[PDB]
């Protein structure tokens, strides 16, 4: 029922146009003779640009599992504490302050987990309640925030952390030019995100600025597994991702969402401010087209699509922040909006200050 | 928050730790280390351990992406018997969990476990999950912390904990190292759930198992290289540190002591000790660090023994050992496992 206190976004120096990454992309080992498709794919994307934590052209020698992932723990590491610093200053609070780290990423393998290596980077007191979760994918930017909830209900006085962290350019190594994985190279990007939330009590001593989280609910669609996730194998975290995935919102979200407002005697003409996951424009039009939206409702969603492109989990978080930015008017609820490997989606009801 | 049921499930394939012995040193390559590996897998302590797969099958396990799919189908299966078996302890029903967590560090899989769980099941489609991914051995333990901290904040819901390891499962990745073939005498299959409900809730459903009172965890300076997964080409490779030990040795005290002081407790008002069974020497390690009795460790050598070290699961087969013991109304208990981080996590129990 708490309240977020900090929000910030963290991205890889690196940056590139859509149209420098496609056409250097097509020049790589294997692809040229699909130039094609991937022009074609990565126009549709409506994404301008991406961040890569590599430099372009080192790609076509990242063809090794073991490489990739070890750059993904180091890399996600400096992210994700970049990430959260920037949130607990912006929250005016320290990494001491931490009673439990959240952490979500579906892009590399660290055992030990991600938020131990932030927890050892930043200092976190050694008592810090560790929650590494992984394999929420794209969903785990509000189901995160829902979980932080979850904590901050049964602890008024407390601090809590979520960061995200997700490297799609890494998972080069499973990539190869069939369609699916094609589709990957067009969308995503790579990004960090940390939302710091503090409990009821700790609100006013803090003086948190930041929406309050009243509500969220998952909701999990049946004989849906197939629709997204990996294909994990010798040559890493493969890709899957079924055409039929738009189909499934259009004929279900519409329930999802009214069947949630309503228990709050709300309807979604009441939500003054959308945060949706940015998944792509099929993806976004069905949400707009389901909930009988108007353009300007995902505005924001659609403008960090084409600046930063699909970042995963992060991406929600991003456009959480720039809406906190636009500052709605205050007394007015918001709604985040989620879906990934599950299939599932995720509500989270907010209240704007 | 209280526990309401605690259930093990163990692959059928089971084999006493002489018939592993004596087909693996006959396998590809480690016909040159026979000496080794029979030195280490008799000083396990193990003398036997459930298998996923048939043992005749292992020396074709050699392809991660293999392996990792046949984690998948099998860790769903075991994980459905384990909460079903754990549901029917607490006289619960699928539709009644508003929350599960699963824990596992031997497979990758997306969408996770509770997502496959959930749907066998037929769990609320607005059931909350929380996959939990690289804790390691100390996510039993961890686990029931998590379950209390969601259930202090939802004292009416139900939440459960499913643990499935299937360490077997990473054979692509072992070589004759020091570190793999130690792994290799230590570790089996299996799985293991845990139920447990709100305060509000305790009364309405008469749950049987223990109160559930605090944990602190427990995240060591500077030690990242005692415990974890490399990561590769052949899927996860055992990264074991000789150092562990002597970090225990050094550490578990102050850790625990630092726990019960914020209850005013000692080490004498502990009833039920409920550790994890990371082998002898660690073991060994617990006892001198906390001088116990050779009583107190007995029940968790007893799980090392039957069914080896099946990662964060055995500290919940244990769990169950101890509740179907009956310790006194009122006594205390201490989970107490450790995992890669490096860390410890502790759990303070009160029991019926
Ligand atoms: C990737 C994307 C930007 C490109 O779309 P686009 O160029 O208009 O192309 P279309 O969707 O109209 O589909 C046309 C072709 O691409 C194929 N295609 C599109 N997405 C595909 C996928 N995920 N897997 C396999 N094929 C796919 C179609 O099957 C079709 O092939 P065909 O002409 O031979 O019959 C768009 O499909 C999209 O937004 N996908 C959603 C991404 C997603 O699922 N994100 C999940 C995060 S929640
Ligand atoms: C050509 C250089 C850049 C390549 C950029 C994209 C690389 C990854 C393609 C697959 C991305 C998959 C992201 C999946 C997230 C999820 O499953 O929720
Ligand atoms: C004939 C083969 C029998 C089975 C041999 C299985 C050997 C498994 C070795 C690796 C176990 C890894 C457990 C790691 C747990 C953790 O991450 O803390």
Redesign the interface.
């Known amino acids: 029922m708490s309240v977020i206190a900090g929000v910030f976004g963290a991205l890889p120096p690196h940056r590139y146009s859509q149209s420098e990454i496609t056409d250097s992309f097509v020049e790589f080992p294997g692809l040229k003779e699909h130039e094609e498709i991937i022009r074609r794919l990565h126009a549709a994307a409506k994404v301008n640009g991406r961040h890569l934590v590599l430099p372009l052209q080192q790609y076509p020698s990242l063809t ?3 490489d990739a ?2 750059i993904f723990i180091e890399k996600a590491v400096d992210l994700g504490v970049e990430a959260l610093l920037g949130a607990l200053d912006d929250a005016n609070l320290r990494p001491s302050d931490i009673d ?1 780290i959240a952490t979500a990423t ?1 892009t590399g ?6 938020d ?2 932030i ?2 980077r930043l200092g ?1 007191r ?12 794209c969903v785990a930017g509000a ?1 995160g925030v ?2 932080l909830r ?6 008024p006085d407390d601090v809590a952390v979520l960061v995200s962290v997700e490297l799609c350019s890494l998972t080069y190594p499973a990539v190869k030019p069939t369609v699916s994985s094609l589709v990957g190279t067009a969308l995503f990007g790579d990004g960090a995100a940390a939302v710091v939330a503090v409990g009821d009590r700790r609100a006013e001593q803090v003086r948190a600025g930041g929406p309050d989280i009243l509500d969220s ?7 849906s ?1 197939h629709i ?3 294909d ?4 890493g975290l493969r890709l899957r991702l079924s055409p039929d995935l738009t189909n499934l919102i259009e004929r279900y979200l519409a329930n999802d969402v009214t069947t949630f407002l309503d228990a709050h005697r709300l309807t979604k003409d009441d939500i003054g401010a959308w945060v949706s996951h940015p998944g792509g424009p099929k993806v976004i039009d069905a949400v707009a087209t389901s909930l009988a939206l108007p353009p300007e409702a995902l505005e924001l969603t659609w403008r960090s699509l084409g600046e930063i492109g699909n970042l995963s989990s992060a991406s929600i978080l991003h456009i959480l922040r720039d809406t906190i930015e636009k500052r709605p008017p205050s007394g007015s609820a918001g709604l985040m909006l989620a879906m990934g ?4 989606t995720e509500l989270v009801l907010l209240r704007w200050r």
């Open positions: 090794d599992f073991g992932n070890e439990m579906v393998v660290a055992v030990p987990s991600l131990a290596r927890a050892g976190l050694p008592d810090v309640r560790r929650m590494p979760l992984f394999g929420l994918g189901a829902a979980r979850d904590y901050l209900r049964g602890a609910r998952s909701s999990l669609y049946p004989d597994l997204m996730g990996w994990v194998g010798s040559h490997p599950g299939f599932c």
